[PDB]
Amino acid sequence: MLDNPFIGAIGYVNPDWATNVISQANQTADPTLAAQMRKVATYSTAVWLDRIAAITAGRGLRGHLDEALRQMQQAGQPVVITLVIYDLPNRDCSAAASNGELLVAQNGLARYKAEFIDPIVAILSDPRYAGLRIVTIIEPASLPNLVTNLSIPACAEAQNAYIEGIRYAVNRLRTIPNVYIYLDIAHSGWLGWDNNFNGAVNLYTQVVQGMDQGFNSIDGFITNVANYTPLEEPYLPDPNLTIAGQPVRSASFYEWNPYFDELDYALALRNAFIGRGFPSTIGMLIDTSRNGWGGCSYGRCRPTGPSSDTSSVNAYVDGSRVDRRYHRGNWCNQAGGIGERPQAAPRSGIDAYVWVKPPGESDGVSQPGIVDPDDPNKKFDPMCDPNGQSRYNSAYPTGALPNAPHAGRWFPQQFEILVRNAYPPIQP
Ligand SMILES: OC[C@H]1O[C@@H](O[C@H]2[C@H](O)[C@@H](O)[C@H](O[C@H]3[C@H](O)[C@@H](O)[C@H](O[C@H]4[C@H](O)[C@@H](O)[C@H](O[C@H]5[C@H](O)[C@@H](O)[C@H](O[C@H]6[C@H](O)[C@@H](O)[C@H](O[C@H]7[C@H](O)[C@@H](O)[C@H](O)O[C@@H]7CO)O[C@@H]6CO)O[C@@H]5CO)O[C@@H]4CO)O[C@@H]3CO)O[C@@H]2CO)[C@H](O)[C@@H](O)[C@@H]1O
Ligand SMILES: [Mg+2]
Ligand SMILES: [Mg+2]
Numbered sequence: 001m002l003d004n005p006f007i008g009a010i011g012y013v014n015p016d017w018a019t020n021v022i023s024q025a026n027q028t029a030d031p032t033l034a035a036q037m038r039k040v041a042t043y044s045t046a047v048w049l050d051r052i053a054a055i056t057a058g059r060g061l062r063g064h065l066d067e068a069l070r071q072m073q074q075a076g077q078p079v080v081i082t083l084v085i086y087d088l089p090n091r092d093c094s095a096a097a098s099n100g101e102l103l104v105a106q107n108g109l110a111r112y113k114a115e116f117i118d119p120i121v122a123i124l125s126d127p128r129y130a131g132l133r134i135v136t137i138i139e140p141a142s143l144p145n146l147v148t149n150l151s152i153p154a155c156a157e158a159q160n161a162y163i164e165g166i167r168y169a170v171n172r173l174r175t176i177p178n179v180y181i182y183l184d185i186a187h188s189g190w191l192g193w194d195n196n197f198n199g200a201v202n203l204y205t206q207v208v209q210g211m212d213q214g215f216n217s218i219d220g221f222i223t224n225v226a227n228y229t230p231l232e233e234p235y236l237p238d239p240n241l242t243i244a245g246q247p248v249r250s251a252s253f254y255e256w257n258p259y260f261d262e263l264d265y266a267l268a269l270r271n272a273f274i275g276r277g278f279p280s281t282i283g284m285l286i287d288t289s290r291n292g293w294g295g296c297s298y299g300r301c302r303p304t305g306p307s308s309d310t311s312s313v314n315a316y317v318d319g320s321r322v323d324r325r326y327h328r329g330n331w332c333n334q335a336g337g338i339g340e341r342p343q344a345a346p347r348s349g350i351d352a353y354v355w356v357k358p359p360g361e362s363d364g365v366s367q368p369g370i371v372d373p374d375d376p377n378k379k380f381d382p383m384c385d386p387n388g389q390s391r392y393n394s395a396y397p398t399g400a401l402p403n404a405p406h407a408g409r410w411f412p413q414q415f416e417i418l419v420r421n422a423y424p425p426i427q428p
Pocket of ligand 3 (some may be wrong): 233236264
């Protein structure tokens with residue numbers, strides 16, 4: 001095992017994702033924007049194993065690991081390909097747009113180990129792929145739900161399936177010696193608050209303390225998967241800066257959460273886990289696929305500096321935050337923009353920026369009454385209603401875009417926004 005699988009290697013370029021990118025660029029009138037989409041098609045996105053069919057459907061997990069070898073020989077350097085292990089029973093328990101095919105009360109935990117994990121680790125140990133670095137991101141939006149959403153019965157039912165299921169997946173993956181294991185730990189707009197933060201460091205510690213190799217079973221964590229939270233709020237650098245006689249962490253957008261951006265958040269988690277037993281070799285990944293926040297949307301443009309308005313912390317922070325979402329929990333089909341491009345070791349503690357959620361794939365269907373044949377449990381969630389209000393705080397619009405298909409399907413109108421709003425902007 002290396003300490004950074006992303007150093008000294010190039011990123012796998014999933015051709016099935018780029019097919020959707022290029023075939024839309026072929027359909028895009030504007031010549032400048034179409035050139036940008038062709039450039040976006042060259043970057044490294046992750047490969048989501050989101051159902052048991054995904055192991056075999058199309059080129060399959062095999063064909064991706066095979067295609068990765070084609071790109072390793074072709075380039076001379078090694079290739080790091082990013083797989084997302086995403087099919088726990090009772091999946092996405094606190095929402096409805098990504099409910100999985102396995103569920104606990106239908107012998108789901110047993111099906112998870114037997115039909116999904118086992119065949120994956122089988123393919124992953126074929127010695128033909130020992131020359132790749134295989135990063136495996138373990139079940140986004142799983143353990144975080146057990147910290148803030150156990151009052152919800154769907155998660156409460158699934159705690160053991162999550163722990164036993166995540167432990168089983170990581171134990172059987174540590175045997176493959178070129179797979180690097182990253183546990184998802186959500187984002188700062190979820191676990192930033194003090195008791196949410198502290199509750200996650202306590203839950204995650206025992207989850208891995210019970211793994212086969214203990215604190216050595218994982219290589220780090222990943223944050224901001226499939227979300228829009230920025231790398232850095234540059235014009236709100238200090239959450240304790242007193243404006244109008246109040247610290248600006250008290251603004252209604254943050255509600256006393258001290259972690260405004262994912263860089264402050266991820267590094268805080270890394271120091272916390274280190275001081276509780278984890279080796280200093282752990283590193284955090286940050287999904288930067290849709291957190292650039294360039295362009296203009298939601299009635300605002302990207303700030304070029306702190307706002308002249310010192311009247312309130314609310315007027316100050318709202319005018320200084322790169323994140324323009326009406327409410328920080330607005331997680332669905334947001335009109336953001338592509339963020340930092342995938343790059344290795346951008347700063348101490350961060351292993352690499354990655355694109356885990358592929359730009360262009362939807363977060364959820366935007367109207368009720370539609371069934372996806374391939375994901376029969378994905379449903380309409382009010383957070384994606386383009387005319388609705390957030391179900392976490394009713395006072396704010398969801399901000400979700402309309403005409404969105406079920407989560408995972410290609411969203412051509414959000415992709416155009418994500419490209420136009422990219423920061424750093426797409427250079428053709
Ligand atoms: O085959 C087709 C193709 O399939 C492809 O793959 C797809 C795959 O199929 C998809 O399913 C997959 O999807 C992802 C979506 O893209 C994500 O958007 C989505 O994840 C959501 C999840 O649904 C949602 O439940 C979750 O919610 C969080 C939210 O992020 C967070 O902001 C919020 O925070 C709360 C917090 O919890 C509270 O504690 C908090 O409290 C404070 C309070 O406000 C304050 O008043 C008080 O003072 O203090 C309190 C603190 O104590 O409030 C906050 C509210 O702001 O909490 C929510 C949970 O409750 O968010 C996630 C996203 O972050 O779901 C999935 C997984 O992420 O994507 C893949 C790829 O696209 C294949 O690729 C392709 O090949 C196929 O063709
Ligand atoms: Mg490391
Ligand atoms: Mg900061």
